[PDB]
Amino acid sequence: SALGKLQDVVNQNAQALNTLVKQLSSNFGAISSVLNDILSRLDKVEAEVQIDRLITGRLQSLQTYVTQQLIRAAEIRASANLAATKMSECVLGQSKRVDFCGKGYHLMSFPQSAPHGVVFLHVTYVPAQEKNFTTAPAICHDGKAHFP
Protein backbone atom coordinates (compact mmCIF):
# COMPACT_ATOMS: atom_id res chain seq x y z
CA SER A 1 0.00 0.00 0.00
CA ALA A 2 3.02 2.42 0.14
CA LEU A 3 2.94 2.61 -3.73
CA GLY A 4 -0.76 3.70 -3.47
CA LYS A 5 -0.40 6.96 -5.50
CA LEU A 6 1.26 5.17 -8.47
CA GLN A 7 -1.02 2.11 -8.39
CA ASP A 8 -4.00 4.54 -8.31
CA VAL A 9 -2.76 6.34 -11.49
CA VAL A 10 -2.52 2.92 -13.23
CA ASN A 11 -6.00 1.92 -11.93
CA GLN A 12 -7.68 5.21 -13.02
CA ASN A 13 -6.41 4.85 -16.63
CA ALA A 14 -7.34 1.13 -16.88
CA GLN A 15 -10.80 1.96 -15.41
CA ALA A 16 -11.27 4.75 -18.00
CA LEU A 17 -10.30 2.50 -20.97
CA ASN A 18 -12.46 -0.44 -19.78
CA THR A 19 -15.39 2.02 -19.47
CA LEU A 20 -14.72 3.41 -22.99
CA VAL A 21 -14.59 -0.14 -24.48
CA LYS A 22 -17.73 -1.35 -22.62
CA GLN A 23 -19.63 1.65 -24.05
CA LEU A 24 -19.35 -0.02 -27.51
CA SER A 25 -21.86 -2.62 -26.19
CA SER A 26 -24.47 0.11 -25.33
CA ASN A 27 -27.48 0.64 -27.65
CA PHE A 28 -27.83 4.47 -27.25
CA GLY A 29 -31.43 3.87 -28.52
CA ALA A 30 -30.47 1.96 -31.72
CA ILE A 31 -31.99 -1.53 -32.45
CA SER A 32 -28.56 -3.14 -31.76
CA SER A 33 -25.17 -2.03 -30.37
CA VAL A 34 -23.41 -4.30 -32.95
CA LEU A 35 -23.14 -2.09 -36.06
CA ASN A 36 -23.02 -5.12 -38.42
CA ASP A 37 -26.55 -6.11 -37.20
CA ILE A 38 -27.99 -2.80 -38.48
CA LEU A 39 -26.06 -3.05 -41.78
CA SER A 40 -27.10 -6.73 -42.31
CA ARG A 41 -30.80 -6.18 -41.29
CA LEU A 42 -31.65 -2.77 -42.85
CA ASP A 43 -31.44 -0.93 -46.20
CA LYS A 44 -29.64 2.46 -46.13
CA VAL A 45 -32.63 4.88 -45.82
CA GLU A 46 -33.81 2.89 -42.75
CA ALA A 47 -30.31 2.02 -41.44
CA GLU A 48 -28.89 5.59 -41.38
CA VAL A 49 -31.40 6.54 -38.61
CA GLN A 50 -30.08 3.68 -36.42
CA ILE A 51 -26.38 4.27 -37.25
CA ASP A 52 -26.71 8.00 -36.44
CA ARG A 53 -27.80 7.06 -32.86
CA LEU A 54 -24.73 4.82 -32.44
CA ILE A 55 -22.46 7.54 -33.92
CA THR A 56 -23.99 10.18 -31.60
CA GLY A 57 -23.62 7.91 -28.53
CA ARG A 58 -20.11 6.57 -29.29
CA LEU A 59 -18.89 10.09 -30.15
CA GLN A 60 -20.38 11.55 -26.92
CA SER A 61 -18.71 8.66 -25.03
CA LEU A 62 -15.33 9.40 -26.66
CA GLN A 63 -15.67 13.18 -25.96
CA THR A 64 -16.31 12.25 -22.31
CA TYR A 65 -13.20 10.02 -22.12
CA VAL A 66 -10.98 12.68 -23.78
CA THR A 67 -12.34 15.31 -21.35
CA GLN A 68 -11.52 13.03 -18.37
CA GLN A 69 -8.01 12.42 -19.77
CA LEU A 70 -7.37 16.16 -20.36
CA ILE A 71 -8.30 16.96 -16.73
CA ARG A 72 -6.38 13.92 -15.38
CA ALA A 73 -3.35 14.88 -17.51
CA ALA A 74 -3.43 18.34 -15.87
CA GLU A 75 -3.40 16.63 -12.41
CA ILE A 76 -0.41 14.45 -13.46
CA ARG A 77 1.38 17.54 -14.94
CA ALA A 78 0.92 19.43 -11.64
CA SER A 79 2.46 16.38 -9.87
CA ALA A 80 5.28 16.20 -12.48
CA ASN A 81 6.10 19.92 -11.96
CA LEU A 82 6.15 19.26 -8.19
CA ALA A 83 8.45 16.23 -8.74
CA ALA A 84 10.70 18.30 -11.06
CA THR A 85 10.85 21.00 -8.35
CA LYS A 86 11.73 18.32 -5.76
CA MET A 87 14.46 16.98 -8.06
CA SER A 88 15.91 20.49 -8.53
CA GLU A 89 15.69 21.79 -4.93
CA CYS A 90 15.79 18.58 -2.88
CA VAL A 91 18.21 16.26 -4.81
CA LEU A 92 20.39 18.79 -6.70
CA GLY A 93 20.40 21.09 -3.59
CA GLN A 94 19.54 21.27 0.11
CA SER A 95 16.22 22.89 1.02
CA LYS A 96 15.50 25.52 3.72
CA ARG A 97 11.74 25.01 2.91
CA VAL A 98 10.20 23.47 6.05
CA ASP A 99 8.35 20.16 5.38
CA PHE A 100 8.92 20.45 1.58
CA CYS A 101 11.81 17.92 1.64
CA GLY A 102 10.35 15.37 4.10
CA LYS A 103 9.57 15.90 7.82
CA GLY A 104 12.58 17.13 9.88
CA TYR A 105 15.48 19.42 8.91
CA HIS A 106 16.48 18.42 5.35
CA LEU A 107 19.95 17.04 4.61
CA MET A 108 19.69 15.43 1.13
CA SER A 109 17.39 13.31 -1.03
CA PHE A 110 18.05 10.34 -3.29
CA PRO A 111 15.71 9.79 -6.28
CA GLN A 112 14.66 6.24 -7.19
CA SER A 113 12.54 5.42 -10.26
CA ALA A 114 9.12 3.72 -10.08
CA PRO A 115 6.47 2.78 -12.71
CA HIS A 116 4.82 6.01 -14.00
CA GLY A 117 6.52 7.96 -11.15
CA VAL A 118 9.47 8.87 -8.95
CA VAL A 119 10.32 8.12 -5.33
CA PHE A 120 12.44 10.40 -3.15
CA LEU A 121 14.28 9.02 -0.13
CA HIS A 122 14.48 12.24 1.91
CA VAL A 123 17.31 12.07 4.49
CA THR A 124 16.44 14.41 7.38
CA TYR A 125 17.98 15.30 10.74
CA VAL A 126 15.33 15.03 13.49
CA PRO A 127 16.36 16.27 17.00
CA ALA A 128 15.40 13.56 19.51
CA GLN A 129 16.42 13.79 23.26
CA GLU A 130 15.58 17.04 25.13
CA LYS A 131 16.86 18.46 28.35
CA ASN A 132 15.13 21.42 30.03
CA PHE A 133 17.32 24.43 30.89
CA THR A 134 16.89 27.85 32.49
CA THR A 135 17.65 30.52 29.83
CA ALA A 136 18.17 34.28 29.38
CA PRO A 137 18.06 36.59 26.30
CA ALA A 138 21.21 38.49 27.40
CA ILE A 139 23.86 38.54 30.18
CA CYS A 140 25.21 41.43 32.28
CA HIS A 141 28.98 41.56 32.64
CA ASP A 142 30.51 44.92 33.78
CA GLY A 143 27.38 47.01 32.91
CA LYS A 144 27.35 45.75 29.26
CA ALA A 145 24.61 43.44 28.03
CA HIS A 146 26.18 40.52 26.10
CA PHE A 147 24.09 38.56 23.55
CA PRO A 148 25.07 35.19 21.95
Binding site: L17, K103, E130, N132
Partner: protein
Protein backbone atom coordinates in the same frame (compact mmCIF):
# COMPACT_ATOMS: atom_id res chain seq x y z
CA UNK B 1 -20.22 -4.10 -3.47
CA UNK B 2 -18.63 -6.92 -5.56
CA UNK B 3 -21.13 -6.27 -8.39
CA UNK B 4 -20.57 -2.47 -8.13
CA UNK B 5 -16.77 -2.92 -8.49
CA UNK B 6 -17.11 -5.77 -11.09
CA UNK B 7 -14.71 -7.78 -8.89
CA UNK B 8 -14.67 -10.87 -6.62
CA UNK B 9 -12.02 -9.14 -4.39
CA UNK B 10 -12.92 -5.90 -2.55
CA UNK B 11 -10.18 -3.74 -1.00
CA UNK B 12 -10.64 -2.12 2.45
CA UNK B 13 -12.71 1.09 2.12
CA UNK B 14 -16.18 2.64 1.73
CA UNK B 15 -18.17 2.18 -1.54
CA UNK B 16 -21.47 3.74 -2.76
CA UNK B 17 -23.25 0.54 -3.91
CA UNK B 18 -26.86 1.67 -4.50
CA UNK B 19 -29.31 4.56 -3.87
CA UNK B 20 -32.15 3.96 -1.37
CA UNK B 21 -35.63 5.58 -1.69
CA UNK B 22 -38.55 5.20 0.76
CA UNK B 23 -41.30 3.49 -1.30
CA UNK B 24 -44.88 4.90 -1.48
CA UNK B 25 -47.10 3.00 1.00
CA UNK B 26 -50.31 3.55 -1.05
CA UNK B 27 -51.85 5.67 -3.86
CA UNK B 28 -53.95 8.83 -3.26
CA UNK B 29 -56.47 9.97 -5.94
CA UNK B 30 -58.01 13.46 -5.59
CA UNK B 31 -60.46 14.62 -8.28
CA UNK B 32 -63.22 17.24 -7.67
CA UNK B 33 -66.37 15.80 -5.98
CA UNK B 34 -68.64 16.40 -9.03
CA UNK B 35 -71.14 13.86 -10.45
CA UNK B 36 -72.96 15.03 -13.65
CA UNK B 37 -72.17 12.89 -16.77
CA UNK B 38 -70.74 14.96 -19.67
CA UNK B 39 -72.92 15.69 -22.78
CA UNK B 40 -70.81 14.04 -25.59
CA UNK B 41 -73.71 11.64 -26.46
CA UNK B 42 -75.76 14.78 -27.34
CA UNK B 43 -72.95 16.36 -29.47
CA UNK B 44 -72.48 13.19 -31.59
CA UNK B 45 -76.31 13.11 -32.15
CA UNK B 46 -77.03 16.86 -32.73
CA UNK B 47 -79.89 17.40 -35.25
CA UNK B 48 -78.01 19.90 -37.53
CA UNK B 49 -74.20 20.17 -37.42
CA UNK B 50 -72.82 23.61 -38.41
CA UNK B 51 -71.45 24.66 -41.81
CA UNK B 52 -67.62 24.97 -41.59
CA UNK B 53 -67.68 28.76 -42.35
CA UNK B 54 -69.70 29.12 -39.06
CA UNK B 55 -68.66 26.13 -36.86
CA UNK B 56 -70.27 25.71 -33.41
CA UNK B 57 -68.20 25.60 -30.17
CA UNK B 58 -69.72 23.82 -27.12
CA UNK B 59 -68.06 24.26 -23.70
CA UNK B 60 -68.15 20.95 -21.82
CA UNK B 61 -67.78 21.79 -18.07
CA UNK B 62 -68.79 20.72 -14.52
CA UNK B 63 -69.05 16.98 -15.37
CA UNK B 64 -67.54 13.45 -15.48
CA UNK B 65 -66.30 12.26 -18.91
CA UNK B 66 -66.18 8.54 -19.87
CA UNK B 67 -64.26 8.96 -23.16
CA UNK B 68 -64.54 5.15 -23.70
CA UNK B 69 -68.15 5.83 -24.88
CA UNK B 70 -66.57 7.67 -27.85
CA UNK B 71 -63.29 5.76 -28.31
CA UNK B 72 -64.93 2.26 -28.31
CA UNK B 73 -67.55 3.33 -30.94
CA UNK B 74 -67.61 1.63 -34.38
CA UNK B 75 -68.79 4.97 -35.95
CA UNK B 76 -65.56 6.97 -36.25
CA UNK B 77 -63.55 7.02 -39.51
CA UNK B 78 -60.80 8.85 -37.51
CA UNK B 79 -60.07 9.46 -33.79
CA UNK B 80 -56.51 10.93 -34.07
CA UNK B 81 -55.16 12.74 -30.95
CA UNK B 82 -52.27 15.23 -31.01
CA UNK B 83 -51.23 16.05 -27.37
CA UNK B 84 -52.79 13.06 -25.50
CA UNK B 85 -53.23 9.30 -26.15
CA UNK B 86 -56.95 8.26 -26.26
CA UNK B 87 -56.21 5.33 -23.84
CA UNK B 88 -55.28 7.95 -21.12
CA UNK B 89 -58.36 10.27 -21.40
CA UNK B 90 -60.23 8.55 -18.49
CA UNK B 91 -57.20 9.12 -16.14
CA UNK B 92 -56.20 12.67 -17.25
CA UNK B 93 -58.35 15.79 -16.52
CA UNK B 94 -59.10 19.37 -17.53
CA UNK B 95 -60.55 22.80 -16.64
CA UNK B 96 -62.95 22.71 -19.66
CA UNK B 97 -63.23 20.83 -22.97
CA UNK B 98 -64.39 22.60 -26.16
CA UNK B 99 -66.15 20.61 -28.88
CA UNK B 100 -65.88 22.32 -32.29
CA UNK B 101 -68.77 20.67 -34.21
CA UNK B 102 -69.30 21.01 -38.01
CA UNK B 103 -69.62 19.24 -41.45
CA UNK B 104 -67.13 19.06 -44.38
CA UNK B 105 -66.39 17.04 -47.57
CA UNK B 106 -64.58 13.71 -46.80
CA UNK B 107 -61.48 14.62 -48.92
CA UNK B 108 -61.05 17.71 -46.70
CA UNK B 109 -60.70 15.82 -43.34
CA UNK B 110 -56.93 15.90 -44.16
CA UNK B 111 -56.90 19.71 -43.54
CA UNK B 112 -58.01 19.26 -39.85
CA UNK B 113 -54.66 18.89 -38.02
CA UNK B 114 -52.10 21.13 -36.22
CA UNK B 115 -49.69 22.68 -38.78
CA UNK B 116 -51.86 21.64 -41.82
CA UNK B 117 -52.78 24.06 -44.67
CA UNK B 118 -55.45 24.42 -47.41
CA UNK B 119 -58.54 26.59 -47.99
CA UNK B 120 -60.61 25.51 -44.91
CA UNK B 121 -57.59 25.55 -42.58
CA UNK B 122 -56.55 28.99 -43.93
CA UNK B 123 -59.95 30.79 -44.15
CA UNK B 124 -62.26 29.23 -41.50
CA UNK B 125 -60.80 26.37 -39.33
CA UNK B 126 -57.14 27.02 -38.36
CA UNK B 127 -56.06 24.76 -35.47
CA UNK B 128 -53.29 25.84 -33.05
CA UNK B 129 -49.90 24.41 -34.17
CA UNK B 130 -49.65 22.96 -30.59
CA UNK B 131 -53.27 21.58 -30.69
CA UNK B 132 -53.83 19.58 -27.47
CA UNK B 133 -56.76 17.30 -28.27
CA UNK B 134 -58.51 14.92 -30.66
CA UNK B 135 -60.16 15.00 -34.12
CA UNK B 136 -63.22 12.70 -34.20
CA UNK B 137 -64.97 12.33 -37.59
CA UNK B 138 -67.20 10.01 -39.65
CA UNK B 139 -68.89 9.75 -43.05
CA UNK B 140 -72.43 11.23 -42.75
CA UNK B 141 -73.63 10.71 -46.39
CA UNK B 142 -76.75 8.80 -45.19
CA UNK B 143 -77.57 11.59 -42.64
CA UNK B 144 -76.63 14.77 -44.51
CA UNK B 145 -76.80 14.19 -48.32
CA UNK B 146 -80.21 14.64 -50.13
CA UNK B 147 -78.44 17.25 -53.48
CA UNK B 148 -77.96 19.15 -50.19
CA UNK B 149 -76.42 22.63 -50.79
CA UNK B 150 -76.59 24.18 -47.25
CA UNK B 151 -73.02 23.24 -46.12
CA UNK B 152 -71.03 26.46 -46.71
CA UNK B 153 -67.27 27.18 -46.66
CA UNK B 154 -65.36 30.49 -47.18
CA UNK B 155 -55.13 32.78 -36.67
CA UNK B 156 -56.04 29.71 -34.51
CA UNK B 157 -59.83 29.38 -33.95
CA UNK B 158 -60.49 32.25 -36.47
CA UNK B 159 -64.27 32.58 -37.23
CA UNK B 160 -64.98 34.70 -40.34
CA UNK B 161 -68.72 35.21 -41.12
CA UNK B 162 -67.23 37.40 -56.42
CA UNK B 163 -66.79 36.44 -52.74
CA UNK B 164 -65.20 33.19 -51.32
CA UNK B 165 -68.56 31.89 -49.91
CA UNK B 166 -69.51 28.56 -51.61
CA UNK B 167 -71.17 25.22 -50.63
CA UNK B 168 -70.66 21.54 -51.41
CA UNK B 169 -73.42 19.78 -53.42
CA UNK B 170 -74.02 16.57 -51.41
CA UNK B 171 -76.04 13.94 -53.29
CA UNK B 172 -75.97 10.43 -51.66
CA UNK B 173 -74.39 9.31 -55.01
CA UNK B 174 -71.31 11.62 -54.53
CA UNK B 175 -66.46 8.48 -51.65
CA UNK B 176 -64.35 11.52 -50.61
CA UNK B 177 -66.99 13.81 -52.25
CA UNK B 178 -69.50 12.83 -49.46
CA UNK B 179 -70.31 14.85 -46.28
CA UNK B 180 -68.52 13.95 -43.03
CA UNK B 181 -69.52 15.06 -39.52
CA UNK B 182 -66.53 16.15 -37.42
CA UNK B 183 -66.18 17.04 -33.75
CA UNK B 184 -62.80 18.39 -32.65
CA UNK B 185 -62.24 18.09 -28.90
CA UNK B 186 -59.85 20.79 -27.63
CA UNK B 187 -58.78 20.26 -23.99
CA UNK B 188 -58.21 23.17 -21.57
CA UNK B 189 -55.30 21.86 -19.43
CA UNK B 190 -54.27 25.56 -18.88
CA UNK B 191 -54.55 25.98 -15.15
CA UNK B 192 -57.63 26.62 -12.97
CA UNK B 193 -59.71 24.27 -10.73
CA UNK B 194 -60.61 21.24 -12.89
CA UNK B 195 -64.28 20.76 -13.97
CA UNK B 196 -64.06 18.01 -16.66
CA UNK B 197 -62.56 14.75 -15.26
CA UNK B 198 -62.72 11.01 -16.07
CA UNK B 199 -64.86 8.44 -14.14
CA UNK B 200 -61.86 7.33 -11.95
CA UNK B 201 -62.89 7.45 -8.23
CA UNK B 202 -61.17 9.57 -5.56
CA UNK B 203 -59.59 7.91 -2.48
CA UNK B 204 -59.49 9.56 0.93
CA UNK B 205 -56.50 11.93 1.56
CA UNK B 206 -53.38 10.92 3.62
CA UNK B 207 -50.77 13.14 5.40
CA UNK B 208 -47.28 12.71 6.98
CA UNK B 209 -46.59 9.42 5.01
CA UNK B 210 -44.96 8.63 1.63
CA UNK B 211 -47.72 8.14 -1.03
CA UNK B 212 -48.24 7.85 -4.81
CA UNK B 213 -50.53 10.89 -5.20
CA UNK B 214 -52.71 12.11 -8.10
CA UNK B 215 -54.46 15.55 -7.95
CA UNK B 216 -56.68 16.41 -11.00
CA UNK B 217 -54.37 14.13 -13.14
CA UNK B 218 -51.08 15.56 -11.71
CA UNK B 219 -49.43 12.24 -10.69
CA UNK B 220 -46.31 12.07 -8.47
CA UNK B 221 -44.88 10.63 -5.21
CA UNK B 222 -44.17 12.38 -1.88
CA UNK B 223 -45.01 13.10 1.77
CA UNK B 224 -48.13 15.32 1.80
CA UNK B 225 -48.39 17.83 4.74
CA UNK B 226 -50.57 20.80 5.87
CA UNK B 227 -48.71 24.06 5.10
CA UNK B 228 -48.39 27.84 5.61
CA UNK B 229 -48.07 28.33 1.76
CA UNK B 230 -50.98 30.83 1.68
CA UNK B 231 -52.29 30.53 -1.91
CA UNK B 232 -54.18 33.47 -3.44
CA UNK B 233 -57.75 32.23 -4.30
CA UNK B 234 -57.13 31.78 -8.07
CA UNK B 235 -53.87 29.73 -7.62
CA UNK B 236 -54.25 25.94 -8.09
CA UNK B 237 -50.65 24.55 -7.79
CA UNK B 238 -47.28 25.83 -6.48
CA UNK B 239 -44.01 25.17 -8.41
CA UNK B 240 -40.40 24.56 -7.39
CA UNK B 241 -37.29 26.06 -9.12
CA UNK B 242 -37.37 22.86 -11.28
CA UNK B 243 -41.06 23.51 -12.36
CA UNK B 244 -41.99 20.27 -10.47
CA UNK B 245 -45.08 20.84 -8.26
CA UNK B 246 -44.15 21.81 -4.67
CA UNK B 247 -47.59 22.43 -3.09
CA UNK B 248 -51.22 21.72 -4.13
CA UNK B 249 -54.82 22.56 -3.21
CA UNK B 250 -57.00 19.48 -2.66
CA UNK B 251 -59.98 19.86 -5.10
CA UNK B 252 -62.51 18.41 -2.56
CA UNK B 253 -61.36 20.50 0.45
CA UNK B 254 -59.51 23.71 -0.32
CA UNK B 255 -56.55 23.37 2.15
CA UNK B 256 -52.95 23.76 0.87
CA UNK B 257 -50.66 20.74 1.06
CA UNK B 258 -46.87 20.93 0.93
CA UNK B 259 -45.41 18.09 -1.19
CA UNK B 260 -41.96 16.96 0.05
CA UNK B 261 -40.31 14.05 -1.90
CA UNK B 262 -39.89 10.76 0.02
CA UNK B 263 -36.59 10.29 1.91
CA UNK B 264 -33.61 9.05 -0.17
CA UNK B 265 -29.81 8.66 -0.01
CA UNK B 266 -26.70 6.76 -1.13
CA UNK B 267 -26.12 3.28 0.39
CA UNK B 268 -22.42 3.25 1.20
CA UNK B 269 -20.98 -0.13 2.24
CA UNK B 270 -18.09 0.02 4.73
CA UNK B 271 -15.79 -2.99 4.47
CA UNK B 272 -12.41 -4.27 5.61
CA UNK B 273 -10.88 -6.14 2.64
CA UNK B 274 -12.38 -9.50 1.50
CA UNK B 275 -8.75 -10.57 2.16
CA UNK B 276 -9.61 -10.01 5.92
CA UNK B 277 -13.37 -10.50 6.57
CA UNK B 278 -16.80 -10.95 4.91
CA UNK B 279 -18.48 -8.74 7.60
CA UNK B 280 -19.64 -5.25 6.42
CA UNK B 281 -21.54 -2.20 7.71
CA UNK B 282 -23.99 -0.02 5.71
CA UNK B 283 -24.33 3.78 5.84
CA UNK B 284 -27.65 5.10 4.52
CA UNK B 285 -26.32 8.64 3.83
CA UNK B 286 -28.56 11.51 5.11
CA UNK B 287 -31.50 9.13 5.94
CA UNK B 288 -32.91 9.01 9.51
CA UNK B 289 -32.91 5.46 11.03
CA UNK B 290 -36.72 5.62 11.64
CA UNK B 291 -37.12 5.78 7.79
CA UNK B 292 -35.01 2.58 7.19
CA UNK B 293 -26.72 -2.99 15.45
CA UNK B 294 -28.13 0.46 14.37
CA UNK B 295 -26.66 3.92 15.07
CA UNK B 296 -27.64 7.44 13.88
CA UNK B 297 -24.45 9.25 12.77
CA UNK B 298 -24.65 12.92 11.64
CA UNK B 299 -23.70 11.58 8.15
CA UNK B 300 -26.68 9.11 8.05
CA UNK B 301 -28.10 5.94 9.59
CA UNK B 302 -25.27 3.39 10.10
CA UNK B 303 -26.10 -0.34 10.36
CA UNK B 304 -23.87 -3.31 11.34
CA UNK B 305 -21.10 -1.26 13.08
CA UNK B 306 -20.79 -0.93 16.89
CA UNK B 307 -20.48 2.64 18.25
CA UNK B 308 -17.31 2.73 20.40
CA UNK B 309 -16.91 5.26 23.26
CA UNK B 310 -13.09 5.59 22.72
CA UNK B 311 -11.35 7.37 19.78
CA UNK B 312 -8.70 6.20 17.25
CA UNK B 313 -6.97 7.25 14.00
CA UNK B 314 -9.49 7.47 11.12
CA UNK B 315 -9.08 4.04 9.48
CA UNK B 316 -12.08 4.13 7.05
CA UNK B 317 -13.74 7.61 6.72
CA UNK B 318 -17.52 8.11 7.21
CA UNK B 319 -18.16 11.85 7.82
CA UNK B 320 -18.72 14.59 10.45
CA UNK B 321 -15.76 13.35 12.56
CA UNK B 322 -17.00 9.69 12.53
CA UNK B 323 -14.74 6.93 11.14
CA UNK B 324 -14.81 3.10 11.25
CA UNK B 325 -12.36 0.15 11.53
CA UNK B 326 -12.39 -3.67 11.93
CA UNK B 327 -11.07 -4.56 15.43
CA UNK B 328 -11.17 -7.14 18.31
CA UNK B 329 -14.24 -10.52 19.38
CA UNK B 330 -13.63 -9.06 15.86
CA UNK B 331 -16.31 -6.70 14.46
CA UNK B 332 -16.66 -3.36 12.62
CA UNK B 333 -16.56 -0.40 15.05
CA UNK B 334 -17.45 3.26 14.44
CA UNK B 335 -15.99 6.10 16.55
CA UNK B 336 -15.21 9.83 16.66
CA UNK B 337 -11.70 10.13 15.16
CA UNK B 338 -8.74 11.20 17.32
CA UNK B 339 -6.81 14.11 15.78
CA UNK B 340 -3.70 13.03 17.78
CA UNK B 341 -2.38 12.65 21.34
CA UNK B 342 -2.85 15.88 23.38
CA UNK B 343 0.33 17.68 24.56
CA UNK B 344 0.64 20.63 26.99
CA UNK B 345 3.96 22.24 25.90
CA UNK B 346 5.98 22.98 29.09
CA UNK B 347 6.30 26.75 28.32
CA UNK B 348 7.42 29.43 30.76
CA UNK B 349 9.12 32.84 30.35
CA UNK B 350 12.65 31.46 31.19
CA UNK B 351 12.58 27.72 30.22
CA UNK B 352 14.14 26.31 27.00
CA UNK B 353 14.39 22.69 25.85
CA UNK B 354 17.51 21.80 23.78
CA UNK B 355 17.99 18.38 22.10
CA UNK B 356 21.11 16.50 23.32
CA UNK B 357 20.92 13.95 20.45
CA UNK B 358 19.36 13.31 16.99
CA UNK B 359 18.10 10.67 14.61
CA UNK B 360 18.88 10.70 10.87
CA UNK B 361 15.45 9.65 9.59
CA UNK B 362 14.79 8.61 5.97
CA UNK B 363 11.22 9.23 4.72
CA UNK B 364 10.00 7.91 1.36
CA UNK B 365 7.89 10.30 -0.75
CA UNK B 366 6.16 8.99 -3.91
CA UNK B 367 5.00 11.21 -6.82
CA UNK B 368 3.23 10.38 -10.12
CA UNK B 369 5.19 11.76 -13.10
CA UNK B 370 3.47 10.33 -16.19
CA UNK B 371 0.54 8.13 -17.20
CA UNK B 372 -0.17 5.52 -19.91
CA UNK B 373 0.14 7.26 -23.35
CA UNK B 374 -3.16 6.24 -25.01
CA UNK B 375 -4.20 7.15 -28.54
CA UNK B 376 -7.67 6.41 -29.97
CA UNK B 377 -8.27 6.12 -33.70
CA UNK B 378 -11.71 7.79 -33.41
CA UNK B 379 -13.01 6.52 -36.82
CA UNK B 380 -12.09 2.88 -36.04
CA UNK B 381 -13.60 3.25 -32.53
CA UNK B 382 -16.88 4.81 -33.80
CA UNK B 383 -17.33 2.90 -37.11
CA UNK B 384 -15.26 -0.36 -37.00
Amino acid sequence: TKCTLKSFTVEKGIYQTSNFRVQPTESIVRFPNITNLCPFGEVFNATRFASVYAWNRKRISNCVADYSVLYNSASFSTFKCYGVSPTKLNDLCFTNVYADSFVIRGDEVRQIAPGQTGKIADYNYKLPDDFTGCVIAWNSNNLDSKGNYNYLYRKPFERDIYFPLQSYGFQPTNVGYQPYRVVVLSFELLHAPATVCGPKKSTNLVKNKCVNFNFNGLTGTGVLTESNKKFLPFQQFGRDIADTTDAVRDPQTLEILDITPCSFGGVSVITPGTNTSNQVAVLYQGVNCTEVNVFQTRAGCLIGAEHVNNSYECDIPIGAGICASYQTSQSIIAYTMSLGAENSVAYSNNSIAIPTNFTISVTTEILPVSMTKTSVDCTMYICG
